[PDB]
Amino acid sequence: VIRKFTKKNVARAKKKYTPFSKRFKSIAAIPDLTSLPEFYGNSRFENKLKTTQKHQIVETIFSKVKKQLNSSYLPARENEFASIYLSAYSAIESDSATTIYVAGTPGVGKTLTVREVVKELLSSSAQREIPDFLYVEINGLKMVKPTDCYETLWNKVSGERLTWAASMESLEFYFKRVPKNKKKTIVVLLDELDAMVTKSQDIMYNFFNWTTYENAKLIVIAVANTMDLPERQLGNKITSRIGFTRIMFTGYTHEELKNIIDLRLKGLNDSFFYVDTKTGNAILIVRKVRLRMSADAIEIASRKVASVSGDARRALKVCKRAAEIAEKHYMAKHGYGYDGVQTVHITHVMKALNETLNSHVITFMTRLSFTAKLFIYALLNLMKKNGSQEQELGDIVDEIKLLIEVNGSNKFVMEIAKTLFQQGSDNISEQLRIISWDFVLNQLLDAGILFKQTMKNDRICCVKLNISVEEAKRAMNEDETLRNL
Amino acid sequence: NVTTPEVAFREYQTNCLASYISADPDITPSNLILQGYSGTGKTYTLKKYFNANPNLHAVWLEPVELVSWKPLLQAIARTVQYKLKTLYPNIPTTDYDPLQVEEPFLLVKTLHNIFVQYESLQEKTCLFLILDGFDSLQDLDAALFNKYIKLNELLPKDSKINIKFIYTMLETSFLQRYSTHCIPTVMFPRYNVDEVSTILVMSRCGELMEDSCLRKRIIEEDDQFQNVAANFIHLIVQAFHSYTGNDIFALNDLIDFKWPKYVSRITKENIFEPLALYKSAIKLFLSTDDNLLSIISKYLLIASYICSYLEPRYDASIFSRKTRIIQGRAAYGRRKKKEVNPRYLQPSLFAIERLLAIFQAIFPIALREESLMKANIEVFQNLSELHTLKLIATTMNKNIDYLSPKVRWKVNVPWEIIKEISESVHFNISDYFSDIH
Amino acid sequence: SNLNRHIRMNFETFRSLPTLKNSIIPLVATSKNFGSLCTAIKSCSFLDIYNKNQLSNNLTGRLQSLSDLELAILISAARVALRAKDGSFNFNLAYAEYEKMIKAIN
DNA sequence: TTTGAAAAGCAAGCATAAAAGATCTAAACATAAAATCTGTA
Numbered sequence A: 001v002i003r004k005f006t007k008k009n010v011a012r013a014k015k016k017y018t019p020f021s022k023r024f025k026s027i028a029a030i031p032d033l034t035s036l037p038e039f040y041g042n043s044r045f046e047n048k049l050k051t052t053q054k055h056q057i058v059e060t061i062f063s064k065v066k067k068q069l070n071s072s073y074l075p076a077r078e079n080e081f082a083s084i085y086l087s088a089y090s091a092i093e094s095d096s097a098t099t100i101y102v103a104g105t106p107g108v109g110k111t112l113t114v115r116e117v118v119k120e121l122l123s124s125s126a127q128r129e130i131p132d133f134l135y136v137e138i139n140g141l142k143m144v145k146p147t148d149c150y151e152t153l154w155n156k157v158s159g160e161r162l163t164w165a166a167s168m169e170s171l172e173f174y175f176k177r178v179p180k181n182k183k184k185t186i187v188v189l190l191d192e193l194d195a196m197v198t199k200s201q202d203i204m205y206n207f208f209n210w211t212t213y214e215n216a217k218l219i220v221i222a223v224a225n226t227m228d229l230p231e232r233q234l235g236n237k238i239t240s241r242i243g244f245t246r247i248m249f250t251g252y253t254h255e256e257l258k259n260i261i262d263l264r265l266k267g268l269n270d271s272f273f274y275v276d277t278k279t280g281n282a283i284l285i286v287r288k289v290r291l292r293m294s295a296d297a298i299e300i301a302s303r304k305v306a307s308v309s310g311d312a313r314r315a316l317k318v319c320k321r322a323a324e325i326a327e328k329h330y331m332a333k334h335g336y337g338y339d340g341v342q343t344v345h346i347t348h349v350m351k352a353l354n355e356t357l358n359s360h361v362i363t364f365m366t367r368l369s370f371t372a373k374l375f376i377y378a379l380l381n382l383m384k385k386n387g388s389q390e391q392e393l394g395d396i397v398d399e400i401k402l403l404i405e406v407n408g409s410n411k412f413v414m415e416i417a418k419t420l421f422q423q424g425s426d427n428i429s430e431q432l433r434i435i436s437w438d439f440v441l442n443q444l445l446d447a448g449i450l451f452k453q454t455m456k457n458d459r460i461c462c463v464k465l466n467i468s469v470e471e472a473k474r475a476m477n478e479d480e481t482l483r484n485l
Numbered sequence B: 001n002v003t004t005p006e007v008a009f010r011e012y013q014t015n016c017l018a019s020y021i022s023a024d025p026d027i028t029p030s031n032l033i034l035q036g037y038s039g040t041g042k043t044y045t046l047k048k049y050f051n052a053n054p055n056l057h058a059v060w061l062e063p064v065e066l067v068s069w070k071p072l073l074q075a076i077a078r079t080v081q082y083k084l085k086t087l088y089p090n091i092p093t094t095d096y097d098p099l100q101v102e103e104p105f106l107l108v109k110t111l112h113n114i115f116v117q118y119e120s121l122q123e124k125t126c127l128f129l130i131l132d133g134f135d136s137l138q139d140l141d142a143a144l145f146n147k148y149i150k151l152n153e154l155l156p157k158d159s160k161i162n163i164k165f166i167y168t169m170l171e172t173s174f175l176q177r178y179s180t181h182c183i184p185t186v187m188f189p190r191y192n193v194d195e196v197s198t199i200l201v202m203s204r205c206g207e208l209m210e211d212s213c214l215r216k217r218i219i220e221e222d223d224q225f226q227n228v229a230a231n232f233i234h235l236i237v238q239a240f241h242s243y244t245g246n247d248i249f250a251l252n253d254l255i256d257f258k259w260p261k262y263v264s265r266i267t268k269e270n271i272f273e274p275l276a277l278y279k280s281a282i283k284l285f286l287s288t289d290d291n292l293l294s295i296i297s298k299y300l301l302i303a304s305y306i307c308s309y310l311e312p313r314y315d316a317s318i319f320s321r322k323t324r325i326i327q328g329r330a331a332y333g334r335r336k337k338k339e340v341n342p343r344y345l346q347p348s349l350f351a352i353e354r355l356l357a358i359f360q361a362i363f364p365i366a367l368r369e370e371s372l373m374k375a376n377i378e379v380f381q382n383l384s385e386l387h388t389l390k391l392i393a394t395t396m397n398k399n400i401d402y403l404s405p406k407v408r409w410k411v412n413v414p415w416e417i418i419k420e421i422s423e424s425v426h427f428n429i430s431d432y433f434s435d436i437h
Numbered sequence C: 001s002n003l004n005r006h007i008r009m010n011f012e013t014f015r016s017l018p019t020l021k022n023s024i025i026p027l028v029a030t031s032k033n034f035g036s037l038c039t040a041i042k043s044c045s046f047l048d049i050y051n052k053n054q055l056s057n058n059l060t061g062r063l064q065s066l067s068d069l070e071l072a073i074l075i076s077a078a079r080v081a082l083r084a085k086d087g088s089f090n091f092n093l094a095y096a097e098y099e100k101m102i103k104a105i106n
Numbered sequence D: 001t002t003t004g005a006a007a008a009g010c011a012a013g014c015a016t017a018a019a020a021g022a023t024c025t026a027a028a029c030a031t032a033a034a035a036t037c038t039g040t041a
């Protein structure tokens, strides 16, 4: 049989097709799923990334500081914690199904608070004030396909591996028809909810409609970017089912960020270390060296980050970058390689904060060649005369030619005109483009300085500035030649 | 350790190929481009260079045959491993299927799996892949060549087999799209008239001498035979270089078309003097010679041209020939003659009823005879046939509804065909355009 | 020196060391002995030949390869496009301009 | 034989239909590995 095409790279999962609704004779024949071995969850890759170390690696004084400020390793989230814990505890205790909506900007401690609520609920269930529950965590951005959530949650409930439609009907039958005394409470965290939004909103409606079912015993904690995500991207059914009591995670104030950073650096700030002067390795309790990071530097970093975002990740990274800058200067001045008072100062914090604020666009255009600068200058002249914000490339060609032939008494132009139009050579004819014309055009397109229209006619194709005009002029005002003309 | 061949007008290009292509992967670029327009000797120079150096391992691929990017990847995967089997037959290998490659990373994985099984070799060698005509791919986009520039970076550095790419390009703008990559490029400028004359002589005199026609016109009626062949090639170039430009292929085709008719006028008097033979066969050097409906349909096409190249306001002046009972004034016609020459522009759009009105105005002709022409079913059948023949076009080309009033009509044929059509039925269509320009 | 002049030309036009390397490599490779290499690096004439070849398929070099009839048709089409407002033309108007030009020449 | 006067032609300007096409999607057509259903055995 001769095949019209071949699919020779098919990788099919071993997932079954029969849903949960057809594996028992009736509703009254379903056994107690709590007393089942595969149901409700009743790591093999960790050995593969281990090797033998044959060098004693030198950890300086700032190494413990930089390891301390990592996001992987709650003074300011106590009302959000109380609200989420009260709602989840009341839904677990009363065998109720509910939705808890949480939204906020990045890094304001939403996932951390939800996980701490879940850990405290598990601690409460361990000592038997609430019935036992299953915890499922589904991130919408960690799914290859959005329907994989259907494959994930059911696999966490029954231990079976099914396809997504069969998993969806299995979850529907489990939430609607299975009695509450026969099942267990399930708390599901939906993280990055905007990634679970499809064109038809099947998954959103299903997940928030299962919470309206009597027998479901399902608690859905939905974590999102904004308050008005259902009112913008979801229908009125899903917006009605999510509810009206929505939990805001506002950005941190500077006191809260300062308290977070001080609670990180609680045991190592204003402390003493044993440091070997020949190598630089530091041991917490040969010179006794006193480590401090100043509270004024942390304070103003907290004030700047809190004014910008309120992001705890940004504040921790600014402090870690300041520690990295101080450690780089320390290892430079002490001659320390890789195998009395050390202070992370305020100037390091201000160097860390300004490094993402300095703009390399003007610095990049300042160090370009003369022909790229001449291109930019001629484009600025065309934008000055005809005022279009989009100039044809042939107009730029004729404006470059005009600027060369008018300032023909300028000494630099007299020295460089043969370079632009003959590459400094006899036996090379007078060219219609300058030397490195498409080179600087593609260079400015690669940098994102310009936008070029997709046309095959080189003259009437238009080119637009992608950056602001005053920084381009500023960069043109630094040069000694283009200032004169 | 490279032999440099001798190409007659490509010395710089051959020296550049000797500079860039070598058996050492340590001093060979990953990518090399040969850019030039058609008939500039790119393929010829590359074949002579690789024939002069048989130690170089080259794989020749033609992307014009492969058409799309997926058969190009599959062809690379097939031909690389076929060349590696025919190069080192004592190496145990696993035959990977070239149809396993549907994506570029699959090509990277397949090439890695092929190349790791040749690590028993002693010296690092180059495998040259010539993509002769990369921008002749019929499914070409701007992002495809970027995937081939960076392909060596995803392959292992310490391999014994080190793949090197040699690209051939036609268009200058396609090459200038990738100028910031700084790929070494050798350019092949177009030949001038003396160069193409010399190339044509030394590439075609050997088979013009040994043609059976030239050896049958002598017997039935070798330096002098070469003189006749070279004089014919020079006469063809002198007559038709203005027509062909500097195209080798067009002059080759003209030599092929005009050689037997030139042989058929060579007598025993014309063989020893070239001027009398040129006067005898003069007609081959003045012209290139490179070439190969019902009455209702013809008048419908003529009426379509009238509807497409006249204005509807002037129709009441040209075709109206009826006696008036109710008092009324006929149209005066256009006031001044414009100079636009409307037959040089694209045709305008007209409706069905204007077409049928002008058609019965121009169609050839007691109380029951009905002199004029009715728009019965065969006129509409002929019009539908004209639309089937693509002699009448619409604004829509697919999912056309013929019955919509928003569908308009235009003629699809030029003037040089309606002149023959109108003179085939003796209609004076040139009078209708004499009132303008 | 000529080498400093070519470095200065690259600095003003390309400011790219791979661009200079792509010309320096066949200067080194095409030399046959030590004295030829020394003369090549003292003169840098191969750099001029390389720069001429890099522009051989541009608009100027493509215009210089045209025949008389091709140049005449191109000038006629450019005349029709300059007279037109959209810069558009076809074969008929360009042939009319060519035919008028040939009658005014003859 | 004139004669004025209404039908008709030309031109500029602006609102607007319409062509051309860029972008995208649904559906027909096509393959294919794992699960599931018959069907004897």
Ligand SMILES: Nc1ncnc2c1ncn2[C@@H]1O[C@H](COP(=O)(O)OP(=O)(O)OP(=O)(O)O)[C@@H](O)[C@H]1O
Residues within 6 Å of the ligand: A070, A071, A072, A073, A074, A075, A076, A077, A104, A105, A106, A107, A108, A109, A110, A111, A112, A113, A260, A312, A313
């Ligand atoms: N209240 C807090 N106390 C201490 N550290 C905190 C606090 N809030 C946030 N952090 C730190 O910031 C990191 C990021 O927080 P988290 O992952 O909870 O953010 P998020 O609000 O869910 O943001 P995103 O929308 O990007 O997912 C945490 O891993 C932790 O290191």
Ligand SMILES: Nc1ncnc2c1ncn2[C@@H]1O[C@H](COP(=O)(O)OP(=O)(O)OP(=O)(O)O)[C@@H](O)[C@H]1O
Residues within 6 Å of the ligand: B007, B008, B009, B010, B036, B037, B038, B039, B040, B041, B042, B043, B044, B045, B170, B199, B203, B248
């Ligand atoms: N320098 C030359 N010396 C001798 N013959 C030549 C020369 N250049 C070209 N020819 C002849 O003309 C033919 C056309 O050359 P070739 O196929 O190399 O052109 P090309 O530039 O690769 O064309 P294309 O882009 O159309 O593939 C050659 O096959 C050969 O017969």
Ligand SMILES: [Mg+2]
Residues within 6 Å of the ligand: A110, A111, A191
């Ligand atoms: Mg989070």
Ligand SMILES: [Mg+2]
Residues within 6 Å of the ligand: B042, B043, B132
């Ligand atoms: Mg070729």
